Amino acid sequence: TVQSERAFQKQPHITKRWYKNAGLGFKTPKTAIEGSYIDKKCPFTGLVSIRGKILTGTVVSTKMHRTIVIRRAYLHYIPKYNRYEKRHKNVPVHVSPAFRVQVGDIVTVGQCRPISKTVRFNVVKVS
Amino acid sequence: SVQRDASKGYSILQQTKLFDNIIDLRIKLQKAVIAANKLPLTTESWEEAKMDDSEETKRLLKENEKLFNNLFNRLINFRIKFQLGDHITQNEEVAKHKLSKKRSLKELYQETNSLDSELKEYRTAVLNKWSTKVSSASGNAALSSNKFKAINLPADVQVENQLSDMSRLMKRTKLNRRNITPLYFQKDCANGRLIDITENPYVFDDEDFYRVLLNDLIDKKISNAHNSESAAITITSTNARSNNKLKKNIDTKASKGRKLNYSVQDPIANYEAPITSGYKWSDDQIDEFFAGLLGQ
Amino acid sequence: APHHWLLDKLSGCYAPRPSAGPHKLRESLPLIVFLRNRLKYALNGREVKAILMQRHVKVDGKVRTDTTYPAGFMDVITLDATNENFRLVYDVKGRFAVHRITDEEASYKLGKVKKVQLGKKGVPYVVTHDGRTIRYPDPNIKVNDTVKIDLASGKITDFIKFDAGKLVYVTGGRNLGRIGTIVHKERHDGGFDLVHIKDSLDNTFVTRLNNVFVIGEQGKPYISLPKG
Amino acid sequence: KKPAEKVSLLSLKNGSMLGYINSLLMLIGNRLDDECKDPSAMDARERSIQHRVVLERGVKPLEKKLAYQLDKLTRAYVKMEKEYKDAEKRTHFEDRFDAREHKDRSNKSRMQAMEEYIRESSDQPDWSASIGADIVNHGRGGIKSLRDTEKERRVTSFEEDNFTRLNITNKAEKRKQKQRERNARMNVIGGEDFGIFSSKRKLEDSTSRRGAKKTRSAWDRAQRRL
Amino acid sequence: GISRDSRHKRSATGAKRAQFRKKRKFELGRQPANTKIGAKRIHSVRTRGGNKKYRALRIETGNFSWASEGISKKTRIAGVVYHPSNNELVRTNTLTKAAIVQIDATPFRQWFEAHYGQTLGKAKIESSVESQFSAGRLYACISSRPGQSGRCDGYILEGEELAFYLRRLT
RNA sequence: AUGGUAGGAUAGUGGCCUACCAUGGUUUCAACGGGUAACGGGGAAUAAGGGUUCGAUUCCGGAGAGGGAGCCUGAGAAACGG
């Protein structure tokens, strides 16, 4: 269940679960706003705020708990070679417990007061 | 031209689907490859291994021999069937006679050299043809003729130029990153029948190209998991890299210093340097005190 | 010393660095180079100081005695020579331009709003690019809108929404102030909200959201942009 | 009735790594052989190192170079299959301000030969100086050069507009007077420059066929003479 | 002399300690200011020119809330019994954030009699806190970080907050 | 070393540190590793009104005040003004 540690967690919220509107054209899934997981580091119903940079990419690794690795890539144009060459740089982002995310699964990610030294972005929408 | 172009597209994907299915044989073979390297190496070490569990080892070695010879015959049979259907082997009459014959181990040995030699002649024809095909199509023949001859070698020629050096690439496949020690390896080197373990010739860990192959697996499996799902993208491939190196052979307590370290800390050798006999008694009456305690 | 100062390379080794003030330092401008270097109006900084002390010039309704007051976009400068009044404007060719304005258009100043926030004791406010804070604003204005300021008080006389169709001047970015100032708006990856501008010579080209400066309407805008 | 044309490189790619799992089965064969005289299994080791160079360096750089057109044939396979199913059912940028965008397109290639040729052609009076007013030191310095005139009216307009002088400091005067006068001793003679013909800057970049944006189609010249 | 600097760490690859700077004033990783119970002691620390952090070295009372009616009085401390992130912190009896500490909430009882007028079985609250008004040793957490606040704040545990924490007590 | 949560510390996100967990992360599209008076690069900067492509303008790679170690005040700082 949700209670799996030595301390109870609940966000202070600056309805028992305060909905927060993201802006930038986004809306919660109904599983997130009527969930039971607390997860104050999740970008919705939490103290962290989503703003600024956005990017979309493909999930490449989902092996471990509450963060995932996104492969985003482009056929990068080397000017001297006159060649579009594919280059991927897999960045790790946080995943909220509102989206059952597997590999593949085109998603959108954005900066969330970056969490632990490489987690710079956070999922906001699946497709 | 629309139907002729994309009928080949069915041929590409069915060759690519058949490409992924043979790596599933390559996935499921590794536990045999790992456990073969821990087998005894010499003739004498096999006999001492047969003494401990003599009746149990004899049925399994016969079961291993039956399962290997069954698997060896059908894999030659599939290689004959593949080269006939992909017009690699020009002699259909010889190849169709090999399929119906019950073959021993040495006849499967010699047919391996037959299928590899026919593949070798097919390879130098294909690799010279397609390297000419891409070089004429790219338009770089009229722009790169006089400056970069050492890099613009044909793909067949680029293969055999690395086949000048069997020596260095055979130093690659003895690299024992897995730290695998065979049975009675310590006895055989001490007896002279065969230490930096990082190069071990009797140990056969071909993991180096296999990790490249498993890197070639994850590159091809990602490109082939487009529609629904492929055979094995990362399941039992990265895990197969892990369990042979004991997932990481590391301890979290030894990392933080939460476990005791049996290593020399190089500044703290000799400031508090030892003393003379600092026991003011002669230490044998304290042995009587330790034997017969004044609390016990 | 960049080129938007529009100053010759001669007569000066160390350019006057602007001091702290109500604008970003890159499009900032001290009044000393406004008088003695672009209006050709004084000759030395010592009489530029004497200009400020004797209070015959003023900026935005305040006397503002400082050599290095930074000057932003279309500030109101008041001088006492035949009761003339001045306003800056941006040029296409990468420079500054000040021109005469009469006193009725000098009474107002149309400025873009920076941020909006509910403040102390539950009241709302809004801030602009020039540091001027207006409280109890229009609730229907959003980010990157504009407001007229009174120049006697700090309140509102006029305001228009940001939209697609009306004159939205460009300021900052790789471009700097093309006349025509509108096509439309759309989004982009990474942010960097796409704003397109069509000139009188009918060419469309994309910019960012922070360069929004809604200057008026087709036909009559609220600014008195001169003739080239 | 005709079989579909298989790709020969993919057959080699499939065939060579079919040659692997056979060759690695040998490696299991010698480790299971109690009478194995070669505990290193060198023969298959050379067999296994053989076919990887085909896989790593033979097929894979070719397959990467063919990757767009191999994908091209597969997507048109996908497109009929949706169409016949439908028939059966029936990135970064800058926006960064720079400096070299509004400087004049004159100073790099102002060419004195064409400006003198149009001076003779376009019948414009040219504001020539007087007879004795040109010379500078009665002697050693030259009579007058046109570049020296162009700098002089520019600095005296700077005098007559911004109302201030400028000094003769030795940091600038080491170059701005000395090699200027040493050039003026040997280049401008009798009021006319002659050293510029002995110079070796090629004059075709500022000219060719009177401008740039010249030839891609036949229409660019067609509306030129029209 | 403790470091809070980011370049001391290894990279995502694990780059081998590039050694760019040494320590400056700006990344001044301060000492851990662990407190204890006792007579109240305050340290004023000047950081960033005009920010005055308040180091609480010893503290004896706190402002702990009771959420079911929303009230908080001043209660004399007794001693910590559990902390989630540490165990020897409890034996040290150093009060950090989220530490479960005992109090003798007599004015909470005195407010209860001054608002209701009924004794505690010697509109209502659940039965598991009636086990220890007779004991007079009520449990409370810590809400604020005492190391920079110079203050001790918390709340009384409420409903499931007991039922998960005496489970973690035993 | 990677994340989880909690705590300490910070002006502040933060594995920055600590506690207890889960074992992971970056790679053939090259991770890691060998060469550079990197007095060499930087539109850094007008130009050079023809000295072939620059004669000239500047940013530039750091540490330190006899040497390690710690402290101190100031919106400035681990000061060569203790």
Swiss-Prot record, chain A:
It is found in: Cytoplasm. The keyword 4Fe-4S does not apply. GO terms for molecular function: rRNA binding; structural constituent of ribosome. It comes from the Eukaryota. Component of the small ribosomal subunit (SSU). Mature yeast ribosomes consist of a small (40S) and a large (60S) subunit. The 40S small subunit contains 1 molecule of ribosomal RNA (18S rRNA) and 33 different proteins (encoded by 57 genes). The large 60S subunit contains 3 rRNA molecules (25S, 5.8S and 5S rRNA) and 46 different proteins (encoded by 81 genes). This is Small ribosomal subunit protein uS17A. It holds the Pfam family Ribosomal_S17_N. PROSITE patterns: RIBOSOMAL_S17. Keywords: Acetylation, Cytoplasm, Isopeptide bond, Ribonucleoprotein, Ribosomal protein, RNA-binding, rRNA-binding, Ubl conjugation. Belongs to the universal ribosomal protein uS17 family. One of its GO terms (biological process) is ribosomal small subunit assembly. It comes from Saccharomyces cerevisiae (strain ATCC 204508 / S288c) (Baker's yeast).
Curated annotation (Swiss-Prot), chain C:
It comes from the Eukaryota. Coiled coil: none annotated. The modification Phosphoserine is found at S19. It is found in: Cytoplasm. HAMAP family: Ribosomal_eS4 (MF_00485). Component of the small ribosomal subunit (SSU). Mature yeast ribosomes consist of a small (40S) and a large (60S) subunit. The 40S small subunit contains 1 molecule of ribosomal RNA (18S rRNA) and 33 different proteins (encoded by 57 genes). The large 60S subunit contains 3 rRNA molecules (25S, 5.8S and 5S rRNA) and 46 different proteins (encoded by 81 genes). Belongs to the eukaryotic ribosomal protein eS4 family. Present with 573 molecules/cell in log phase SD medium. Component of the ribosome, a large ribonucleoprotein complex responsible for the synthesis of proteins in the cell. The small ribosomal subunit (SSU) binds messenger RNAs (mRNAs) and translates the encoded message by selecting cognate aminoacyl-transfer RNA (tRNA) molecules. The large subunit (LSU) contains the ribosomal catalytic site termed the peptidyl transferase center (PTC), which catalyzes the formation of peptide bonds, thereby polymerizing the amino acids delivered by tRNAs into a polypeptide chain. This is Small ribosomal subunit protein eS4A. It comes from Saccharomyces cerevisiae (strain ATCC 204508 / S288c) (Baker's yeast). The gene is RPS4A.
From Swiss-Prot, chain D:
It is found in: Nucleus, Nucleolus. GO terms for biological process: endonucleolytic cleavage in 5'-ETS of tricistronic rRNA transcript (SSU-rRNA, 5.8S rRNA, LSU-rRNA); endonucleolytic cleavage in ITS1 to separate SSU-rRNA from 5.8S rRNA and LSU-rRNA from tricistronic rRNA transcript (SSU-rRNA, 5.8S rRNA, LSU-rRNA); maturation of SSU-rRNA; maturation of SSU-rRNA from tricistronic rRNA transcript (SSU-rRNA, 5.8S rRNA, LSU-rRNA). Keywords: Acetylation, Nucleus, Ribonucleoprotein, Ribosome biogenesis, rRNA processing. Residues 217-226 have a biased composition (Basic and acidic residues). Residues 170-226 are annotated as: Disordered. InterPro entries: Sas10/Utp3/C1D. GO terms for cellular component: nucleolus; small nuclear ribonucleoprotein complex; small-subunit processome; sno(s)RNA-containing ribonucleoprotein complex. Its main location: nucleus. It holds the Pfam family Sas10_Utp3. Component of the U3 small nucleolar ribonucleoprotein. Required for the early cleavages at sites A0, A1 and A2 of the pre-ribosomal RNA. Participates in ribosome biogenesis. Present with 1430 molecules/cell in log phase SD medium. This is U3 small nucleolar ribonucleoprotein protein LCP5. The gene is LCP5.
UniProtKB/Swiss-Prot annotation, chain E:
The keyword Cytoplasm applies. Pfam families: Ribosomal_S8e. Belongs to the eukaryotic ribosomal protein eS8 family. It comes from Saccharomyces cerevisiae (strain ATCC 204508 / S288c) (Baker's yeast). Component of the small ribosomal subunit (SSU). Mature yeast ribosomes consist of a small (40S) and a large (60S) subunit. The 40S small subunit contains 1 molecule of ribosomal RNA (18S rRNA) and 33 different proteins (encoded by 57 genes). The large 60S subunit contains 3 rRNA molecules (25S, 5.8S and 5S rRNA) and 46 different proteins (encoded by 81 genes). Residues 1-30 are annotated as: Disordered. Present with 15900 molecules/cell in log phase SD medium. There are 2 genes for eS8 in yeast. The modification Phosphoserine is found at S65, S68, S72, S85, S127, S128, S131, S134. It is found in: Cytoplasm. Component of the ribosome, a large ribonucleoprotein complex responsible for the synthesis of proteins in the cell. The small ribosomal subunit (SSU) binds messenger RNAs (mRNAs) and translates the encoded message by selecting cognate aminoacyl-transfer RNA (tRNA) molecules. The large subunit (LSU) contains the ribosomal catalytic site termed the peptidyl transferase center (PTC), which catalyzes the formation of peptide bonds, thereby polymerizing the amino acids delivered by tRNAs into a polypeptide chain. Keywords: Cytoplasm, Phosphoprotein, Ribonucleoprotein, Ribosomal protein. The modification Phosphothreonine is found at T61, T106. It comes from the Eukaryota. The keyword Ribosomal protein applies.
